[PDB]
Structure formats: C-alpha cells, structure tokens
Amino acid sequence: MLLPKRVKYRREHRGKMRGRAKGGTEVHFGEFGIQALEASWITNRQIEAARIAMTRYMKRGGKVWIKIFPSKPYTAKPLEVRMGSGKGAPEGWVAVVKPGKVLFEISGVSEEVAREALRLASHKLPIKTKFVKREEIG
Amino acid sequence: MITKTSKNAARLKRHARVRAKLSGTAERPRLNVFRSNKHIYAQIIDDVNGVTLASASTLDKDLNVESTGDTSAATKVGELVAKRAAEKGISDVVFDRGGYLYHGRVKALADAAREAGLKF
Amino acid sequence: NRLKEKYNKEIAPALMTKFNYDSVMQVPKIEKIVINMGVGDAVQNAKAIDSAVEELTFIAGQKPVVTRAKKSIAGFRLREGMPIGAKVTLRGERMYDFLDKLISVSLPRVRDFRGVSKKSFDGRGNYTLGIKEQLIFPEIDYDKVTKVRGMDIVIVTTANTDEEARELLTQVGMPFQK
Amino acid sequence: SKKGVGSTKNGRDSEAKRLGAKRADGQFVTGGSILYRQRGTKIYPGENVGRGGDDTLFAKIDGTVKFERFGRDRKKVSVYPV
Amino acid sequence: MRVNITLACTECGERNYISKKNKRNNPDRVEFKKYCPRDKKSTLHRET
Amino acid sequence: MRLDKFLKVSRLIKRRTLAKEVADQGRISINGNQAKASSDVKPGDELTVRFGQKLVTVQVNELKDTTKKEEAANMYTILKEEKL
RNA sequence: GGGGCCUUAGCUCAGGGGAGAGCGCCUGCUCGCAGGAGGUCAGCGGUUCGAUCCCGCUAGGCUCCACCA
RNA sequence: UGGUGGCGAUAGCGAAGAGGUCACACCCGUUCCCAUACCGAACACGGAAGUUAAGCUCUUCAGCGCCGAUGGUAGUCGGGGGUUUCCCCCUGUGAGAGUAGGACGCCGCCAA
RNA sequence: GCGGUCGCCUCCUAAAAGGUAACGGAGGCGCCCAAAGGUUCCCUCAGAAUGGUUGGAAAUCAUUCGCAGAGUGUAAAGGCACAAGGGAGCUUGACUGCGAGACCUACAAGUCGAGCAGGGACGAAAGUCGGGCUUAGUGAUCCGGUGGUUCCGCAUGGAAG
RNA sequence: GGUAAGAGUCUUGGAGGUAGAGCACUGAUUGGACUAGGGGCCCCUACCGGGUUACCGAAUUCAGUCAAACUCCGAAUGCC
C-alpha cells in the first residue's frame, strides 16, 4: 500500500501518455527487471499484488526495488448522480507508466527464480511485459 | 577575525547608486571627483564615447600649493578644472559626487568650479 | 592609554620574534567590545526599561542603546516592538582603558573563575567570556538594585587564525585555563 | 431516482487584462504610445522609453522600436530616432 | 473609524479638498497646507 | 433573561432547579409584585428573593450569561438584609 | 444522499493573548465555606508569533428535506 | 600605476607566489566643518612615522561556477496509413541533457 | 424543485501574440496607512555551527557559509538586493488647469502618458514628486442635502427657484 | 468617395514559456552511507549515563523518479 501522505493538490488532470519513457528505462539497481511495452495507469493495489507475488516466491533472497510510485490521484464521482455539478472526490492513486520503463528490480537470486517471480508479477499487471537484464559493454 | 570591506568597496556601490540617478549623457557632461588619502583628482567623462574632456589635479609640475590637498587651497585646482573646461568651450556640467558625502572638501571643489564659470 | 604604549613596546617585537612574518608591521589590533544584556524582564513585566538601559552606563562609559527583536519566538514574545535587552558598542582608546582594569581586577575577583576558554574559541579568533553578577566591576556600587544582572564580553582580534589569536591573548596578559 | 450533490465553490475568475507586446521591432512609433503592458518589469525600459505607474513601457520620442537585452536573462525596449 | 473628511481653506473658506483619516489614530483636527485655486498660492487648509 | 437563569449566573442559587422551585413556590418578587420563575429582568430592578428565614434584597447592574466567578459577581449589589 | 448546528472534566453544558460552572471524588471547617485528581478542547494540515476560537477535509451525534411523472 | 566607461560570471569564487621609493591603500590623532537610535567601526578634518599583512594589479592551477559545438534523438508545420485513451512512413525544420572544446579577461579616454 | 452562485482581483485549464467556455480546479476583496505617502542621505535578508549567566531547540550579541532558501500592509502571479527591501532628516505632489499620443473595444466605462503654465516639498546641483512595487477594496441615472458662483430668473427691481 | 493601401511567398528582426526535456526552485518520492532524536533488553533509575540495536527516520549528502497551478532550458507552427 503506497500513497503520498500529503499532496499540493488533491484533484489533478488525467494527463496524456504519449511517447516513450522519460526516465527509468535501463536496469541499474538489480540484475533483472520488467520493461513496459504499453502505457496504462498502474494502481497501487496492483503494485502491492505484484510485490507480494514476487516476495512470497523469493522467501530467501534479496530485496525488491519498486521503481514506480503512485503519485497521481484520480477522482471518482459518486454513482447514480447527474453529470457535472463539481468534480468528484479522489478515490485512489496511480502511477503513470510509459513503454520502456522499468517497474520492479531484483538482484541476489538465480536466473530461473527471477524469471518466475517476474512472470508472477507480470500476470498481475495490466500491461504487456518483457524480461530484461543488465548489459555490461562496459 | 573581522575581514570587513574597504572604504573604496562601498564607495563603488555608492558610485553605482549615484550614477543610476543621473545619466550624464545629453551633450552635457559630468564632473567626477575622486578623493584619495593624500590628494584629490578631478575628471570630466561623457558617455558614450568615453573621452575625457578635461582633467586636472594637485599632482602637477605647475601650481605649487604646497599644501597638496589638506586645507581650503584645493579651491585653486577646483577653479583650474573650470579653467580647462572654459578653454575647451564647455557650457555646463552636472556634479558627480561619487561615494563622498557632499560636505567638503569635495564641496570646496564644487564651489570653486561654480565661482569660476561652470553654471551647475 | 598605558596599555596602548605597553603592547606596542613589548608584544609587537615579541610576536615577530616568536615566528617569521612576511610583513614587519603586521600586529593584530583589537576592533570592538560589545556588552549584551538580554534581560527578558522575567517575564515581560519589568517596565523600567529606561533604568535597565542606564544600569549599563556604569560599566561602559559610552551611552548604551536597547536592541529590538527581529523575529517573534513563541516562548517569550517579545513581538516586533517592545525592545528588550541592551547592546553597546564602545570604541576608541577605551578598549585599552577597559582591558587594563579588566585584567587588573575583574578576573581574580570572581570566587570560582580560575581559567576560561581553553577550547571556547570560534576557529577564527574569538574570545567570549561570561559574567554573572555586577560585583565583579569595582566601580559598580553595592547599594544598587542588587538583582542578578550579567555582563557579556566579546573580544575581536584582527588575526584570522586561532593559532595567532591564542598566542596574542596569552602574552597580552589575560590568563587562560591551560 | 435523481439525487443532488454540490457544490463547486470555485466558479469565479477575474477579467483578463490584455498584457503583452503592443508594438513590434522595426516599427515606426509615435511619442507617448504604449509599447508593452506589464505586471512588474519583465522587460526594462531603455533609450527614450519611460515606465508608467502601472509599469507600462511607452515611447518618449518618435522613432523605431528596438528590442535588446541587458544580459544574462534581462530584456530591454529602446526607441531610436530616424 | 475611517470617515470621509473635507479640507477647507482658512483664508478663502471654500472646501477645495477631500481626503480620509482614521478617527482612532487621529482624533484631533488635521492641518495640511495645500494649493488654493482661488488664491493662486499654497494656503493652510483646515478640516470642516 | 429569565429569573432562574439570572439566579444561576449571579450565584445566589447555585442550582437552577432549586431557583425554579423557590420562584415557583411564590417567594421572589420583582419591583414589589410577585412573579413566576420566568419573569424577564432589566438592569435597574429590585429583587426580593426570599431564602429560609432571610429577606435578601439585591440590585441588578448588568446581565451576562457567563458560568465563571470572574464575570459573575458584578451584576447583583446587596442593599439591605433582614433576618425576620 | 443533500443543507444547517455541535463533538470541551466521569455526566450535562458555557467559552487569537493561552479556557470554566452544577452534580460525581477528595482536602479541614464547625448550610454554607475557601482549595486540589481528571481536558490528545474528536483527529489530520495552512496563515502568522501562538488556535477551542479562523479555515480544507475525515469519522461521529441532533434538526430539515429527498418532491413531479 | 591610478581614476573613469562598454562588452550576457569566455569578466567570478578557491589555492600559490610578487609589488610599493611615485601613485593607490591600510595606519596615526580630534583642535576644527560633520557624527552614529551609541561609536572617529561608518561619514568628515589633518599627517607622512611603520608597511605590502589586508584593499588593488600582474603571473600559473579547469577544483566549483560559466559559455559551448557537430552528429544523433525527442518533438513538430504539411501530406499519407492503421490494430484510432495511441502508433507508423515521407519532404522540411529541429530541442533539452551529455560530449569534443573554450575560458583564471578584452576594447576605450585622461593623468602620472 | 431543492442545494449552490450572481459584482471585482490573481493563477491554471488557455493550445509558446492577444482572446477563449463548463454547477472546471485553487484563493482573496467591499479595506488599511497622516503614515506603511514625497524627496534626500545611508545599510543589506532568512537559516547552520561555535561561544555565552539567568538561554534550554529556539528571547538578545560576534563570526563565517550565505544572488536571496527573507521581506515586499492585506492574496495569487509577475517583479525587486544598480533594490520597489530596512533606518534617519525635512515635508504634504495624497495638486490646480490641463494634456500630444496610445492600450482594451458594442456602448457606457476603464488604463498609461512625454510635456506647458501657476504655486510648492526635498536636494548644493542634476533631478524627482499629479499617493502606496504593480494588478482588487466598488456601482450609472433620477431625486434631494451642503459650500461657492463678474450665470439665468417670466413687465421692472428683488426673491422663490 | 480614398484611390492601390489589402493578401500570399522569399529575406530579416522581435515579443510571448506550449510540445519536449530537466531538478536550477515548489511539492511528492525509491535505495545506500550518514545517523539529531525516539523502541525493547543487562549494569543501574530513589536518577545521570554505557552496551547491543540485523528497530524507525526530522537534518545533510551520492544516486534514481514525477508534476496543470515546478521551470536552469526550450521547439515546430501561429502573431506583430
């Protein structure tokens, strides 16, 4: 459960998700990670589900780096009301994720353990995923 | 311990705040006075060409004072600045007091320039 | 004015024979001594501000002034007005005339002070000593208001290092804790 | 089944004041006319240009408006006679 | 506490100026000398 | 205000129920005439509240509804007291 | 669900400069006294030098509506 | 060398040397013109004993700060197409960041 | 229907001139100041550490690091330490008649303005001053009240008006 | 009636902070050193302190993110 405890504004515009990832494109903390291929809002509930799904299967191993944070709130007008008459109340928090962005980072385990943990994380996410690793040119 | 600024350091800021008020460039030049610890200097500078129209001081081969800028004998070079101004056809100037408070002996130079022909 | 001739006749060659200098003239003079009151009125109740400021006139011959707050602080407000505390900046040859009677009588008169500031330097050459009572100065009379009013002194040395300021204030005559 | 909800509490705004440039670079200008409308000195007055009480930049003489810069992040309006 | 006041000239007598003052800070009658258009000179003006 | 409220805030009767019972039993008179527990009082009246074998007569000065003794003992002024 | 009024001692209620009564508990004093235990002033966060006092929200307790097919 | 101006900290901060007999500066005293919410610290006056230690100029460090390409990429005017909360080509423009590099000052006037 | 709102000012939405809507998202104003106004002359803020006796994390004082992390009456943006930000002296320009030329554009209205004359304030002089760093703090006409008036006033002289 | 101003395009010069980027401000943040301060437990506390914390994190700092009401920057087009 991730959320900011204080915000400058409680109601914000929904924004746009055009283009690739501005940052967080390359894996640089862990050894393996998930690279996003499509853009959608990722709810903190989905982030918690993916984190528990990785952490349970990695009961012995390193820690998980969560590269995304749900800083943008979304508002939800109450049901069965007419359109307009003011913006509704904020309901939850989402993270704006663009294609190419690294979502979660794992180091300190084997190859197949990391692949299966990332598959179990990816089956909870609403986006198409792929497996990436660190490249050492370099 | 204390490394307070020099008297010339705040004098430059005072000169900057004085020169903001008067431009000195309308075909009418300015009379700049620099007071040192030993004697005084005087120059006439006009923007934008920056040429010095007239300049005089106590430190010269002629005009043995020989007070060299302590007493009210600085009025001699104060009127000699107006003499070099009148020999080159200067009509009028403004007074650029610099970072010095106008109570003398820069005021003595200003009064000597006023009595000798500069109508400021 | 005796200490004014005394330091120029004794300490000024002593510093240059202590260790080498690029400049022969570079003796560090003294610059300012400030006295700080900080009464607080215990608390905000003493309305005799004009007598509290004139209490400082016995210590320093120049007229002291009250100081005004720059920011209100929630414990003891003291708003932007109501000036509380006193600061006097005394200069001239009166540094020499003040330090003469200071190192004459003020330091040994205290019942428990035997050494101050073996570590209390600022790192750039500051001496600051705390005075708690008025009985230290002999010119203060014993039939005064008798309440505990403390003095503060700040000694400013022209030399910019601790190793120079400490070696000047050792040989000017003011003792240290050691 | 209709149900009501409210309210907005943010439905007010002031009238927009038409700031910005009123003349252009290289344009002939008459004396006294408004060059640039301001809230504070976003652009400083320069040669033959005064600043009003509402910080309005205006030409003092007839001429040609030139936009310059003080440096590094400061601007100027000047009017030079023809 | 902030009321509309007028300032009449002491010499001419006409009410030439209007201003405002705070009654709590200024209980007394104010005295500002201003230009009188009838007298062609700056005269003392009094609040009426 | 009401009579029982005035007796409560003036601390003559500390409890409003006791003041209500005393005024309902026909013991308190305002300006000579008898009155109930809800007679409205004015600053400048002559109360004639009757205790047990007392004849305390007070004078109304102000009317403030504060339940604190700092702002309560400034409304009634005792004129004379009679035991019997 | 939408407006309006409150959340203050154990209970019931008054109330920008640092907050109180009656009852319930004590304290010595022979129908009344002069004093003490108990207060996140329901909670968060902004304006300044401080908020029970001003505000944007969360839970709670009352009051008025939730009508026309 | 001193005074006085113009060039977007390529003009600056930090370190190390050198200068003073002329000039500039500290420095020394208050009798005068003048003073600080107080004070010759600041602003005034009169003096050339002591000095470059500081102020100031010259000489080297690219550490901090500053300026800054070429190519590439993102974006985009216009045209076109899909799998149309978005994506892909074509003609032309073209960032920001980063890198190569530059930089520890030039151009005027007067006096000595 | 009910709830909410109705005028003015600031930001975003607003798409790199201007302008631009919604019961869109955030806030303020129906003032204040005889000075917080004008001029002249000086100065530079907030925070960290060290040292201090009542000072403890903070009352007051010295030092560095401080291009502004302060302040700018009130509230948002723009701007301001060549200070519009702080401190003193003298004052009332918080002015009379105006005003070339401009900005916004249904009109009504609103805003800036070089410069002339009359009288000043400050400053040696240059010069500045027609209110506050700017942008809100306010409403037509009609009808009455007050002061002035070489204006008219129903045959004339007055008066009512 | 004025008459040839109007418009498009090439060239040139400007104003204005959007797309994009970035932390140089304002927030929100993820990791490591760093640890102001708070948490248990033993000597002790009638009370000062000390040890271990595989314990939280206000400062500060090396990194990594994000922003309509953040901008050290900054287009293409539009505008004059």
Domain residues for the domain of F40 are 1-84
User: 3-class SS at B74?
Assistant: helix
Q: Could you tell me the strand order of the sheet in which B30-35 lies?
A: B52-57, B40-45, B30-35, B94-96
Other beta carbons less than 10 A from residue A22's beta carbon: 10
Let me know if chains C and B touch, i.e. at least 3 Cβ pairs under 8 angstroms. Answer: yes
C-alpha distances in Å from residue A104, one per residue of A52, A136, C127, F3: 12, 20, 58, 76
Count of structural domains, chain F: 1
Q: CA of A33, closest CA in chain D: separation in Å?
A: 44
Q: CA of C32, closest CA in chain B: separation in Å?
A: 10
Verify if strand H has an atom below 7 Å from the CB of D68: yes
Rounded CA gap, D74 and D67, in Å?
11
Taking alpha carbons only, the member of C169, C85, C81, C166 closest to residue C123 is C166
Closest protein residue to I2 (Cα–C1')? D4
Rounded CA gap, B14 and B35, in Å?
14
- How many angstroms is C1' of J32 away from CA of A131? 26
Measured over the CA atoms of residue B89, residue B91, residue B95 and residue B96, the dihedral's sign is negative
- How many angstroms is C1' of H48 away from CA of C158? 24
Q: Which nucleotide is nearest to B16 (CA to C1')?
A: I82
DSSP H or E stretch at residue C128: strand C126-130
Rounded CA gap, C79 and A4, in Å?
37
Helices (H), C2-128: 2-18, 49-55, 94-101, 107-109
**To what resolution in angstroms was this structure determined?**
3.0
Gap between the terminal Cα atoms of chain C: 29
Does some domain include residue B73?
A: yes
Strand B52-57 and strand B94-96: the pairing is unpaired
Rounded CA gap, A1 and A52, in Å?
11
Which tokens is B112 given? 């000597």
Under 8 Å between Cβ of A4 and A93:
yes
Measured between beta carbons, the chain A residues lying within 8 angstroms of D8 are 85-87
Verify if strand I has an atom below 7 Å from the CB of E30: yes
Count of structural domains, chain B: 1
Verify if strand G has an atom below 7 Å from the CB of F71: no
Bridge partner residues of F47 (DSSP):
F30, F58
Write down the residue that tokens 């309440």 correspond to.
C147
Rounded CA gap, A44 and A97, in Å?
12
Measured between beta carbons, the chain D residues lying within 8 angstroms of A81 are 3-5
- Method for this entry: cryo-EM
Measured over the CA atoms of residue C81, residue C84, residue C88 and residue C89, the dihedral's sign is negative
Give the 3-state secondary structure of F33-76.
Answer: EECCCCCCCCCCCEECCCCCCCCCEEEECCCCCCCCHHHCCCCE
Which tokens is B62 given? 């002629």
Helix C94-101 with C2-18: angle, nearest 10 deg: 90
Contact residues, chain A to chain D, C-beta under 8 Å: 78, 80-82, 85-87
Rounded CA gap, A9 and A5, in Å?
12
Bridge partner residues of A31 (DSSP):
none
Query: What does the domain layout of chain D look like in residue ranges?
Result: 19-82
Taking alpha carbons only, the member of C10, C44, C52, C3 closest to residue C27 is C10
- How many angstroms is C1' of G29 away from CA of F14? 21
Does some domain include residue A56?
A: yes
Rounded CA gap, E48 and E19, in Å?
12
Bridge partner residues of F74 (DSSP):
none
Instruction: Examine residue B66 and say whether the peptide bond preceding it is cis (omega within 30 degrees of 0).
Output: yes
Query: What does the domain layout of chain C look like in residue ranges?
Result: 1-178
Q: What share of chain B is helix, strand, coil (3-state, %, to 5)?
A: 30, 20, 50
Rounded CA gap, D10 and A10, in Å?
14
Give the 3-state secondary structure of chain D.
Answer: CCCCCCCCCCCCCCCCCCCEECCCCCCEECCCCEEEECCCCCCEECCCEEECCCCCEEECCCEEEEEEECCCCCEEEEEECC
Write down the residue that tokens 């009250």 correspond to.
C66
User: 3-class SS at C100?
Assistant: helix
Rounded CA gap, C128 and C154, in Å?
5
Would you call A102 exposed, middle or buried from its count of C-beta atoms within 10 A (0-12, 13-18, 19+)?
buried
Bridge partner residues of C108 (DSSP):
none
Count of structural domains, chain A: 1
User: 3-class SS at C169?
Assistant: helix
Instruction: Please judge whether C126 and B1 are an interchain contact, meaning their C-beta atoms are less than 8 angstroms apart.
Output: yes
- How many angstroms is C1' of G52 away from CA of E20? 39
Rounded CA gap, C100 and C106, in Å?
10
Domain residues for the domain of B80 are 21-120
Name the residues in C69-98 having a C-beta closer than 7 Å to nucleic acid strand H: 87-93
Taking alpha carbons only, the member of C106, C103, C90, C116 closest to residue C33 is C90
